[PDB]
């Protein structure tokens, strides 16, 4: 390897002198067809370089290539001709650096990956969703999570990447792909997904519980008369297997992952990792099964009954999810689901869930079967939280005295008796002093918060509507 690092540095120098050139877009700019025709020769020589990989680092630059690649990725919307093979060439470039990456910029890999989702058109998003979960995220969750202690991005920035995914895409294929892969690959995803349903924006409150409910089909109340069966979750496309020199590489999904670099490169004519099927994996599963970690199959029917067959719970809907990869392959590689002091912020999520239920509001019933399932009123809950809870539930009683003669309004006025009434009876048992302290016209600053308090007008009509909601509150028994 003498002229290969020389010619990669020469193209780095070419893009550097074209970057110090202020981007006036003077022609000839090389088109994306010509850019990917050059980088296809670069992909072939990178294939012949990464045919000997087993830290076998050559003398290539991977740090300035990162900033050159993100500036090229921001030159993607400035292009017209040749965008699909440009995206394929960017994909080949980044995945061939993935064995030869430094551990200082690899932590900020997948957020920068999702940061250019909105710049791409939706017809390139299918290649994005067909390549990410194969290559980009798993090596960041495998190669970088062995060194914990540092702040990793699946702890902090997973909610950010998932909000951007809920924002910019409208495919249950894309959201189901990213939700299953990030839940299966890393634990404690449910707390950050609760945290993004909690303090996320308002337009991602419908789909982040809609696409959750494929994987969380339990928060429906019993006797589940449901008319919100819009976009019935047909799962994602079965992945077309890269290993050309296999036998069954047409239709079946993958179950393990070949990450051994030299065999994958010199056998599949495609970058590592190779996602191996059930029949594909068991050839090198005898000596190299420390690399093969269990992947799961696209389940278009995730059962609302519990997925373990030896059922013993009384309620067929099972709440808690644990996702180890021990024995989740007795049904067709299907994700098996299962059945203390962390409660209060969960109820805070419900405060922020039902706060924008003022104006298809099926999330009120999800809060109803959330609050009575595993949220316990005790002395661990502080005074401010209980005051905030009783004030927000009083606004919910008044706002459900509204919404007259709509179907979801008829459903929320059907489930308003016999479900929250025992909760208010427990409230009257344990903390009736703080409720009648909150029934005072101007309470303490821990109580009268939120809502439409931002008014540049008189606040005494707010007290008149407070007396009106007390009037609507009295014949509720």
């Amino acid at each position: 390897m003498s002229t290969k690092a020389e010619q990669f540095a020469s193209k780095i120098r070419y893009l550097q002198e074209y970057h110090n050139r202020v981007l006036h877009n003077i022609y000839p700019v090389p088109s994306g067809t010509d850019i990917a025709n050059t980088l296809k020769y670069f992909s072939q020589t990178l294939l012949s370089i990464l045919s000997r990989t087993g830290s076998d680092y050559p003398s290539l630059d991977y740090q300035g290539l990162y900033v050159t690649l993100v500036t090229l990725l921001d030159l993607v919307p400035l292009l017209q001709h040749g965008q699909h093979d440009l995206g394929q060439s960017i994909f080949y470039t980044t995945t061939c650096l993935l064995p030869f990456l430094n551990d200082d910029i690899l932590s900020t890999l997948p957020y920068t990956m999702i940061s250019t989702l909105a710049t791409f058109p939706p017809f390139l998003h299918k290649d994005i969703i067909e390549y990410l979960s194969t290559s980009f995220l798993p090596m960041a969750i495998l190669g970088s999570s062995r060194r914990e202690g540092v702040p990793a991005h699946v702890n902090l920035s997973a909610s950010s990447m998932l909000m951007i995914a809920m924002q910019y895409t409208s495919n249950p294929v894309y959201h189901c792909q990213l939700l299953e892969c990030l839940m299966k690959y890393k634990q404690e995803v449910w707390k950050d997904l609760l945290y993004v349903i909690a303090y996320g924006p308002s337009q991602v409150k419908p789909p982040a519980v809609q696409m959750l409910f494929h994987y969380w089909p339990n928060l429906k109340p019993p006797g589940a008369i449901s008319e919100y069966r819009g976009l019935q979750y047909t799962a994602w496309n079965p992945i077309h297997c890269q290993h050309i020199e296999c036998h069954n590489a047409i239709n079946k999904p993958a179950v393990k992952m070949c990450i051994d670099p030299s065999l994958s490169v010199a056998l599949g004519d495609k970058p590592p990792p190779l996602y191996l099927c059930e029949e594909c994996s068991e050839r090198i599963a005898g000596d190299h099964s420390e690399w093969l970690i269990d992947v799961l199959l696209p389940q278009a029917e995730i059962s609302a009954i519990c997925q373990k067959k030896n059922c013993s719970s009384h309620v067929r809907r099972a709440v808690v999810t644990c996702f180890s990869a021990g024995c989740c392959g007795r049904h067709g590689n299907r994700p098996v689901r299962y059945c203390a002091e962390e409660l209060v912020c969960a109820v805070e999520a419900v405060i922020s869930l039902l706060k924008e239920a003022e104006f298809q509001r099926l999330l009120s019933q999800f809060g109803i079967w959330f609050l009575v399932s595993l949220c316990t009123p005790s002395e661990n809950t502080p005074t401010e939280s209980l005051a905030r809870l009783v004030a927000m539930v009083f606004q919910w009683f008044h706002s459900t005295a509204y919404m007259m003669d709509d179907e979801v309004g008829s459903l929320v006025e059907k489930l308003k008796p016999q479900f929250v009434t025992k909760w208010l009876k427990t409230v009257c048992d344990v903390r009736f002093d703080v409720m009648v302290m909150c029934l005072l016209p101007k309470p303490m600053e821990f109580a009268r918060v939120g809502g439409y308090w931002d008014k540049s007008c008189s606040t005494v009509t707010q007290l008149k509507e407070g007396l009106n909601r007390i009037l609507c509150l009295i014949p509720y028994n």
Partner: protein, 254 residues
């Protein structure tokens, strides 16, 4: 100025009750002359006259909803001290007055409010200190007062506030802004707190006051428990108190 403000509120009640009287250009010259008198382009009118002028501007924008391109309404000022005077007197009272919130009543739609967003960022970044803090206050009030209608454009201004943090523009005003961000938890912080703990709180500072602000925001951040969903009329009172602080700061001779 108090009966003059009474006159202007007489005009304002005529606009409030009779919407069809907004056609004659004499009313438009009244709007233009009261805006240029409120701007003064050292002697500023009191709060009722300024409230009357801003409510007149608010009515003229809602009523003539097809004409009146806002680029001369939020007027052109090549001098930046006139620009920060526009931010103080014209912009942020307009933001506080326009925010009623009733879902059956309309308000300023999407293109004028994104012009406002790009306006405040282009004040902030060039596409020296009190003008920058006033721009942070304008960004503060448009973020808190327009929660429901800026539902498309979060990531681009996430990159702009990323650029703000990369340049340390203003200094401690950025730390007060991110302290508000991590305190009240408005939904841009989900794309900002990994940038805090991974870049800003991971790379230390050098100035001792910036160290004390950094330890302050670190103790506010590292407590991962339940935050305070404030009543936020006290946030409006903080806007008025900061407005009065800067109002006595600019009429003090220096």
């Amino acid at each position: 100025w108090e009966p003059a403000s009474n006159l202007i509120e007489g005009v304002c009640l005529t606009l409030q009750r009779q919407p069809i009287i907004s056609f004659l250009p004499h009313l438009r010259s009244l709007i233009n002359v009261c805006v240029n008198l409120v701007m003064g382009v050292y002697l500023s009118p009191p709060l009722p006259f300024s409230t009357a002028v801003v409510r007149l501007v608010a009515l003229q924008i809602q009523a003539l909803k097809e004409d009146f391109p806002l680029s001369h309404v939020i007027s052109p000022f090549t001098n930046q001290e006139r620009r920060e005077g526009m931010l103080l007197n014209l912009l942020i009272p307009f933001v506080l007055t326009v925010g009623s919130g009733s879902k059956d009543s309309p308000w300023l739609e999407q293109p004028e409010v994104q012009l406002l967003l790009q306006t405040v960022i282009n004040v902030l970044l060039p596409p020296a200190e009190s003008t920058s803090q006033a721009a942070y206050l304008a960004l503060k009030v448009i973020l808190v007062c327009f929660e429901r209608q800026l539902g498309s454009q979060w990531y681009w201004l996430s990159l702009q506030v990323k650029e703000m943090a990369l340049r340390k523009v203003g200094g401690l005003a950025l730390w007060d802004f991110l302290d508000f961000i991590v305190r009240t938890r408005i939904p841009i912080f989900v794309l900002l707190r990994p940038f805090i703990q991974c870049k800003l709180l991971a790379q230390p500072a050098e100035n001792h006051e910036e160290l004390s602000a950094r330890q302050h925001i670190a103790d506010q951040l590292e407590r991962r428990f339940i935050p305070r969903p404030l009543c936020k009329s006290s946030l409006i009172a903080e806007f008025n108190s900061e407005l009065k602080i800067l109002k006595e700061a600019v009429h003090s001779g220096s």
